Amino acid sequence: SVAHGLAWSYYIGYLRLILPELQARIRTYNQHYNNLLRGAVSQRLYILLPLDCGVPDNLSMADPNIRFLDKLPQQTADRAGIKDRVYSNSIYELLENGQRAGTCVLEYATPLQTLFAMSQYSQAGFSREDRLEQAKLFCQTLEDILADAPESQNNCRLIAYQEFSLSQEVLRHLRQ
């Protein structure tokens, strides 16, 4: 299946490589780069899983209550012949009634945009109406893989949703 392969690849090709190094990057930010007066950035990568497969590039566009704070210090690694392949991640403030309710590392699972694009291109042999079932299968496969990887599971949170306040969706997970 398409979504089955995409979830395994998202784990093998990305999550497996960044999640064991994420805690140290967040700790480094909180100790040396975070504004001295501010609350600590929460641990864990918060992964946005829009079931409609809509993956925008700017988060403040999806919700003005999601405001860009800072980039986490970059991770580098030699990867498949790419010397010092760079992994960059962004920190966001979550506003509730004009005030800071949370601070976290946040991004969309980019393979969901592949499902969106495939549903549009005739050559992909992927019907438009197959998108939702494939997005749910991508999320379920990712949950199943993470359940067998505790250093990856405890370093991330899966935020699956169907449309709305995206910041309230993230805050509900953060407050747990």
Place this chain on the structure above:
Amino acid sequence: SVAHGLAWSYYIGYLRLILPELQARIRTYNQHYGAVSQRLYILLPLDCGVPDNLSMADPNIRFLDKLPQQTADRAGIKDRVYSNSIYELLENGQRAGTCVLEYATPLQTLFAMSQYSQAGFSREDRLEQAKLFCQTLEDILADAPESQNNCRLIAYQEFSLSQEVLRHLRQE
């Protein structure tokens, strides 16, 4: 199919985003500094063996430099960095070529899936999946001119990896 999805995702999620900007990065590198050839040379090992160091696979493939990085806001990641590496290709102690080179990382997903019981993917099906990944990628690129002329697909089964790359480089 697993490989069909991987090839579409490798194109949508990566190649489509770096290949229209690649020529300008190579030109910028060549003008500061014998020229690095155009096009991203994509290694497609059908055995799905994806090592992290290229000089390990072949000592005639020597790291020269990193191309200037590309940055873009991508899915909530501000200034998502795309870094690529330049390699010298040696032949009988002489530099015979210079190119931007890397492995197609989804091939390592096929390798890992054939290793993990929970993936439900057999080692006996891996070669057919690696070939399908390569064929799907070729078909996609045939419909994306700006991506097709900015890359070269190097599919092989094991050996001299530098001679494999040089054979493709000498066709232009």
